[PDB]
Design a protein around this nucleic acid. Structure first.
Ligand SMILES: *Nc1ccc2c(c1)Cc1ccccc1-2
Length: 580
DNA sequence: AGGGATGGTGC
DNA sequence: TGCACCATCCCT
């Protein structure tokens, strides 16, 4: 059963062929400045295992790594690329990434290691990473003999699986999506994570101090109003105080005890002064624990930068996700939380933060795919889409649209952009399900194209078994045929929503690639720092702002050509908060 | 030490 | 609780 391979003590020319499966193993989940525990190379000349201290110190090996003409096939090349960036080594020539290939073929499979991908093609001569490294506290790098065989088997699997994976992608008409979009994007994300974002820790620490003070104040007030002290953070104890001791009404139940979510508390506020204080306590606590303390934990003391990791092969819609820290969910809606963004600053003196965001890309994509005459005309006129929606569903003139009418029309659009359930809408409008469905009915009368699209896409999902995005990303929806109403309804919502969310993801991804090509052609020092679904955040010398103001929006707006224009707004300032 | 339940940020 | 990540509480 054992797999043959050479445990090399030195690097040989045979190991530097122009085509090979390459494994540069980084076991630590966060690969930033992390160790490379071993190297495996599989090519036409055989299978080899190399100790990192040796390989990475060899001029020839390093040169082979950085030679774009020497093609490598890998699994999660970004992990290797970044780990190597921290060591000052450039990785080039990656022509195939099995992780991204598996992700495109079926995001739902949840492929996170070579074994999971190989299993898709009935290849099982390789162990799951968790089985070799263990999990959690018991996690550890095994002895060399065990380590080396694992890495060689992973390289071997990649070597064998490249062809079948590429062939299926071609059949799915997704080979260009891999080769021209995701793989090039992987290199861009690597540069972004490696660059990182500078943090004003002093500012964060001072905010933390002020929060602790307000938190202590509110906390005492809460005990005062409750007549005793308790753990405000335990839904259990909190429930006893609110619903038992204070006799507040139970408007919502939970599969445990009482519900204490913000939306529930807001409704209870009129009954007792303790409620508003609990709401306020949570607001501050969220900022303190999750953002202030959470951010300070991951900032690198030597550079005062945070280096997020963009998971490129996770979401079911084609979006990226961000972790340790998650820089895609920094507060902005409420002013108090928004202030957190003042802590994110340019990495160089006299540089500024520049942010560009698509204006309603999801609804513009919807107008395009549904070919709805009314919605397309609205965007061609660059109308306020919520006011316009209110005018149509309520049958009134623009001057007749009240603030509440626009708010509810906006809730309807928010529901369509995110594919929320009918139940989620009724509450967002704080009305009855019967009345909610009635709003949707009026919307379809005003946007019959959107109606037809929703009906047609659900039918297509059932027929083909999946739905696709503009650039051919796909999502299988097996629940679309379920006889369970709730399970089927969810699948139907995804059939409608994935082409919208997924196409928006495809577009901004291509925009990033197009943008980097333009920045290079122009020799601008500006560079991408973050992507937050429908917006790109960069930093650059103050002297490049005027040029970026014209270049970034244009590139983002021209990434793709739709039946309606794409519109991008932009701002810049001394901190992220200022890049309004 | 893990991890499910609940709650809250973002798009 | 649409797509995500992660905080604290608290049972096992
Ligand atoms: N996608 C989605 C699903 C359910 C719910 C929302 C969005 C918002 C909300 C508010 C209250 C209950 C349920 C939901």
């Amino acid at each position: 059963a054992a797999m043959a391979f050479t445990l090399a003590d030195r690097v040989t020319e045979e190991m530097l062929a122009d085509k090979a499966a390459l494994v540069v193993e980084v076991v630590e989940e966060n690969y930033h400045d992390a160790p490379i525990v071993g190297i495996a190379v599989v090519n036409e000349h055989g299978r080899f295992f190399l100790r990192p201290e040796t390989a990475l110190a060899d001029p020839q090996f390093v040169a082979w790594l950085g030679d774009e003409t020497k093609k490598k096939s890998m699994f999660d090349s970004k992990r290797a690329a970044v780990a190597l960036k921290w060591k000052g080594i450039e990785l080039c020539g990656v022509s195939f990434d099995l992780l991204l290939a598996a992700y495109l073929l079926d995001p739902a499979q949840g492929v996170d290691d070579v074994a999971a991908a190989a299993k898709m093609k009935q290849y099982e001569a390789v162990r799951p990473d968790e089985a070799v490294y263990g999990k959690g506290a018991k996690r550890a790098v095994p002895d060399e003999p065990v380590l080396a065989e694992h890495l060689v088997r992973k390289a071997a699997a990649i070597w064998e699986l490249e062809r079948p994976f590429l062939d299926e992608l071609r059949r799915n008409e997704q080979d260009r999506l891999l080769v021209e979009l995701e793989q090039p994007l992987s290199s861009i994300l690597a540069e972004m994570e490696f660059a990182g974002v500078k943090v004003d820790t002093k500012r964060l620490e001072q905010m933390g101090k002020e929060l602790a003070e307000q938190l202590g104040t509110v906390e005492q007030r809460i005990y005062e109003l409750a007549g005793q002290e308790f753990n405000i953070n335990s839904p259990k104890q909190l429930g006893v105080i609110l619903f038992e001791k204070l006799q507040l009404p139970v408007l919502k139940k939970t599969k445990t005890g009482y519900s204490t979510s913000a939306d529930v508390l807001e409704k209870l506020a009129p009954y007792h002064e303790i409620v508003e204080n609990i709401l306020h306590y949570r607001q501050l606590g969220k900022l303190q624990s999750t953002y202030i303390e959470g951010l300070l934990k991951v900032v690198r003391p030597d550079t005062k930068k945070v280096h997020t990791i963009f998971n490129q092969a996770l979401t079911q819609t084609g979006r990226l996700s961000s972790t340790e820290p998650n820089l895609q969910n920094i507060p902005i809606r409420l002013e108090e939380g928004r202030k957190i963004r003042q802590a994110f600053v340019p990495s160089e003196s006299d540089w500024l933060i520049f942010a560009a965001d698509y204006s309603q890309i999801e609804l513009r994509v919807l107008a395009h795919i549904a070919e709805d005459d009314n919605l397309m005309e609205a965007f061609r006129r660059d109308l306020d889409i919520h006011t316009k929606t209110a005018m149509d569903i309520f049958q009134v003139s623009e001057d007749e649209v009240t603030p509440n009418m626009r708010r509810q029309a906006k809730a309807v659009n928010f529901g369509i952009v995110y594919g929320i359930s009918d139940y989620g809408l009724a509450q967002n409008l704080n009305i009855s399900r019967k009345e909610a469905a009635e709003f949707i009915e009026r919307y379809f009368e005003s946007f019959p194209g959107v109606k037809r699209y929703m009906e047609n896409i659900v039918q297509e999902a059932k027929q083909k078994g999946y739905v696709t995005t503009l650039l051919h990303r796909r999502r299988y929806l097996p629940d679309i045929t379920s006889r369970n109403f709730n399970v089927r309804s969810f699948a139907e919502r995804m059939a409608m929503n994935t082409p919208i969310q997924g196409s928006a993801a495809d577009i901004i991804k291509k925009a990033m690639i197009d943008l980097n090509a333009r920045l290079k052609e122009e020799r601008l020092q500006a560079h991408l720092l973050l992507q937050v679904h429908d917006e790109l955040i960069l930093e650059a010398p103050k002297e490049e702002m005027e040029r970026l103001c014209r270049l970034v929006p244009e590139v983002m707006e021209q990434a793709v050509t739709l039946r309606v224009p794409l519109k991008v707004d932009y701002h810049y300032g001394s901190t992220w908060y200022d890049a309004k």
